[PDB]
Structures are given as C-alpha cells and as structure tokens.
Amino acid sequence: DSHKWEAREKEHYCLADLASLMDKTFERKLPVSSLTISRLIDNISSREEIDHAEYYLYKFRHSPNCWYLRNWTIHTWIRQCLKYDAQDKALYTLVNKVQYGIFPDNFTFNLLMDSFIKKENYKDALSVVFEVMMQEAFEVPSTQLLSLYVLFHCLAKKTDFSWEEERNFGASLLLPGLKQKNSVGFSSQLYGYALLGKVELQQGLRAVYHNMPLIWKPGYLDRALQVMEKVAASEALDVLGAVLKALTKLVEQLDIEETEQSKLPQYLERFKALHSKLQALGLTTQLVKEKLSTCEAEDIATYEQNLQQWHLDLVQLIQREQQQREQA
Amino acid sequence: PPERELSRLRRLYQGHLQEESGPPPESMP
Amino acid sequence: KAYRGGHLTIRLALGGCTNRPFYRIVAAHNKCPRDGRFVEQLGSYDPLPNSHGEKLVALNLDRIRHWIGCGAHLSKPMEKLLGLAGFFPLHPMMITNAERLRRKRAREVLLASQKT
Amino acid sequence: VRPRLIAELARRVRALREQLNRPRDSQLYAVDYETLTRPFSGRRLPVRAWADVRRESRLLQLLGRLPLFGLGRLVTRKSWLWQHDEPCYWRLTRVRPDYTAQNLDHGKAWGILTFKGKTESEAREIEHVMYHDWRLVPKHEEEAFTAFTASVPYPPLLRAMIIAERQKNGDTSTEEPMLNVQRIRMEPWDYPAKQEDKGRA
Description:
The structure is cut from a larger assembly and holds chains A, B, C and D.
Chain A: H1 19-27, H2 38-41, H3 50-61, H4 71-84, H5 108-114, H6 127-131, H7 142-153, H8 165-174, H9 183-186, H10 189-197, H11 227-232, H12 238-244, H13 265-272, H14 276-281, H15 291-294, H16 301-311, H17 314-321
Chain B: H1 3-10
Chain C: E1 8-11, E2 23-29, E3 40-45, H1 64-67, E4 73-74, H2 76-85, H3 92-105, H4 108-111
Parallel strand pairs in C: 1-4
Antiparallel strand pairs in C: 1-2, 2-3
PDB class: ribosome
Keywords: mitochondrial ribosome, ribosome stalling, cryo-EM, ribosome
Entry title: Structure of the stalled human mitoribosome with P- and E-site mt-tRNAs
C-alpha cells in the first residue's frame, strides 16, 4: 500500500519558483486555483517543507475558494508525512480540523491508522481514533479497525476517563455500531450506550450533543434496554452504572414527561430481570483478533479505481490552465 | 388547549412566567 | 409627496378641542401625519356620548370595500370597530380585555367575599 | 436646468464603497459572550434570545467541520425541535463560506426546505444563517427522524347585505352564503422566508 500512487505524473521540481507565486496572489487578494496548491504538496522532501505547507494550507483554507480542497490534495499530502514522520506534524492538521480542514473520509484515514501501530504508537493512536469519531465515516470495514483499537485502550487506561472523554469513549463505538455480523458487534453498542448514559444525570443531556453527532432524545439506557432483547431475540459495564445513578442550569424538558432520575427503580428491575434470558438462551479484546483475518479483504480495488478517477481529474484541469495563458 | 401545548409555552419562558386560571366566567354584576 | 415605499391606511383623526375628542376615519398614505392630508374621506366616529347617551359612528362601507378592496392596511382601533359592529369579526385583543376585566372582576368576587 | 454634477458623482462613490470596503459577515456576526453585545454595532440582543447565542451553537460553526461542507446533509433549527415534533429541516446544495473569519462560520448557503414533512423544490437560501439556533442530525437514526404522515360563515352586517341583495334581485335563496378558506393558505409565523428579499446592513 505504498507504491501504487508514487509514479506521480512527473512535473517541475522546484519550490522557490512557486512559493513566491501563491502568497503574491494572496497579497493581491486574488483567489488561488486548486491546481497551484498541489504543486507544492508533491514537492515535499523535507520537514522544513512540511511547515511550508502548514503556512500555505492555512492561508488556502482561509481563501475565497474554501471549497476545491480536493480529496487527492489531502492524499498526496498523506504520502509525504507517512514518508517522513507519521508521528507529530502529520497529526497537527487533524487536531485543529478547521484552519486546514482536510476531512479525507476514505481508505485514506486507515493508511495513517495502520501505519500508526507499526511503531505500536499508543499515544498518537488515541487522537485520530477520536477525530474520525467526530467526522462522518464507518461505511467501511474500518469499523473493525477502530473497534479493535478502542478496546486496546479500554484495557489500558482505567479511570473515570474524564469529564468529557468518558463521552468520547462511547461515541466511537456506536457509529461503528453497524455490525449485524456478530453479537459482539451488538455487544459493542452496550458498552457505549452505557457510559453515554452515565453523563445523563451527572453532567446533563446537552453533554451528548456538544459538537459530536448524537441526538437529543433523553433515553440511551433505554436504547440499550431495548436492543438487548433483540439480541435475546437472536456486558459487565452496565452492571456498575445502573446502580451508581441510584446511589447518591436550563431545564429544557416538559413537566409531564418525567426527569429520568425518578425511573431508577424501573432501571434496575427492567435490566436485572432480563439478563437471565441470555443465561436462558445463550473476552472482548480477543474477539477483535478474530475479525482481523476473517473480514478485511483490503479494499484496494476502489482505491486504485479512485486513482483512475483522479487521473481523470488532474489532466483535465491542467487542460483548462493551459487555455488561460494563450488566450491573453 | 390540550395540556401538552400548555406546558410547551412553559418550556420557553421559565425565567418569566405568571400563574393563571382556566376559564373566564359567564357574567358579572 | 414621494414616499419611499408607502402604502395606504385607513386611520383615525383628531378634530375636536382639548378634552373633546372627535374621530373621523380617512383613507390616506401611511406616512402622512395623523392630522394631515388624506387621499379620500370616509365617515366620522363620535367617541363622546351625546344627549341621552350614544357613541356615534359613521361608516360608508361602499368605498371601504373599494379601498380595503384595493388593499388598504388598517388601524388597530378601527380594526376593533368593525368587530364591535359586525363588518369584520371581533378583534382578539378586544376579546382578551373583555375576559381580562371579567377575570379582573373575577378577583372582585373574592375581595367582596373576604370582607362581609 | 442646473444639473447636479456633484450629486451624480457622489452616488457611485457610495456605490463603490458599499461594494469595496463593505464589511463582511465575519466582523458583524460575532457576539460578545460576557456582555452580550456585538462588535462594530454595540446593539445588544434581546433578553429572550440570550441563552441560544451564549449556550448553543450556530450553523456554520457546526458546519465548519465536515467534508464538502455538508454537500447533502440535514440541519434542524433549535426552535423547530421545541414547537413541532413533525420533521422540519433543510437539505443543502451549495455553500459560499467566509475566508477572513477565524474558526470558520458566518458564510452563505442554500438548499432544500422540508417544513414539518412538507417538502418543496426550487432551492432557495436558508434563513438565520448567522443565528445560533441550530442542531445537526446524525446519520445514525437518520431515516426515522424524517418520518411523516372547511368554509366559514359571514360576519353579520356583511351577511345582512347579501341576503338583502337576493331579496332585491329576485330569488329568496335561504342558502347561507359561505365564503371559503380553501384557497387561503395558513403558513405559520415560524416559516423561514427567502433571504435575498432582505438586504444585509
């Protein structure tokens, strides 16, 4: 998964001939084309040129063409930092997420996720885990990939996990909670539905929809207390917390629907009289090492198809750029 | 009104509310 | 005069002396003043109870169906007045203050009760 | 005739300074969250809309973190949650976001409205783009969120005319005259209107 692109549609091999054109067209307050941004990004052979692109993609993110940041312009940047470091300044676009604004929601996310653990990368694979959690993804077998990895640091870091990183824990499992294949893909939702429900009565209902894509209905224990019956029509975290709330600011709900602190007796007996059906019909970190070779047939077929859709792109846009120099 | 919409206004103005009666009467001498 | 985006309104006007009101409904521009010039003249409204107690109104309701027929905006007190008669239905704010004073007479039936 | 050579040339020089050094959205749609005023204007927001700016979040500061700036995504207003459980929302077709603005928001966009389930073609501009009453619909539970399912008598004096015109013209016709409602449409006060009917100050 390296030398598929790197026959790279050969071109000019300079930077100072082009680093004084983009800002010159920035200081004239003119827009900048989406073709002239790429020709610095392919010219990366150093880390001094990495912060050259950080001084340029910042100003092109804040350009009147806030669109036309094309997906391969991200990906041709994904090659260079995987080439050089893939440790710190490769990440430092994705943390701010708006002063550069890539969003490469593809197989391009996974190429810097699998190249993480090749150094075993325990710290810098906590972040992109959280930063593709917020972005719209998970129509891909990378649903297996993050779920294999959130249960690497569920086994590693063991605290109250934060004020708001407890909410970051559950939010990274439900959007990969799309797994009709196995019961642990449904027993992964019971993990996240639990500790998203623990912030319901300590920290507020608004804490689940700050920035992260979750909805405003106040029941997430009851989104867990209904689907485990569907698994029972076909989990040791919820045992602590459901008694924990029963142990010892703007109001936006209604005076007839109850504030759900008063449904904790109907939260115990609705759950505790139901887990016996799993005992009547019929640990996790090993179950993700089963799917690693079961599925994951490595969808490179649409990757190289995207490489041919991009060869449809860059030669036709350059065919435009040649017209605006001869007609003048 | 149905009592759910009567509470719906009570959702909006929780810092500024008075209390009230229901029906106005029929006549007055 | 040329008024930037003017429409036509059917307003009331003062024409009596001090402490003697006398209203008179007019078809006019929106931005001309209350006492000022109108486009066309319509009936008078007498707010003072005359001999043996009547509060008189005149309404030529043939040309207001030519003027609200031609899309004239109204004034709120005249909006109540055709509901007090029956050319229009009754205004909601006239219904509320009817019920409010009733409810302000429904606090009188406990102030009368708690004394005797 | 004495022509106004000055008052003619003084009109383009306002029309080329409401066009050249106009301030964009970025410098007049920020809000102080500690005094509740505005930069460059100073005019405080009414006390009915204090929590929505202070405690909730805008549209394009929610839409500043998505690929293609939400090329077809769903957006819901904060009020539309609290007034109608019926699905009222937009879709999107185009965005024209600002560039001077740090921490991108305040831009321009347009898309497709669906009011409490009633959809419409002819994509127009969104209302309240700078307003802070906005929430995003996540694509987990996206399909069931969008799940949707006479004539009046006359006031009495105008009633008194038509019955008398019948008695004048020849027929008794004790049929009551019934003016209709069924042409007059009743869109609510919560319906957002078109944007370029308004002008930006």
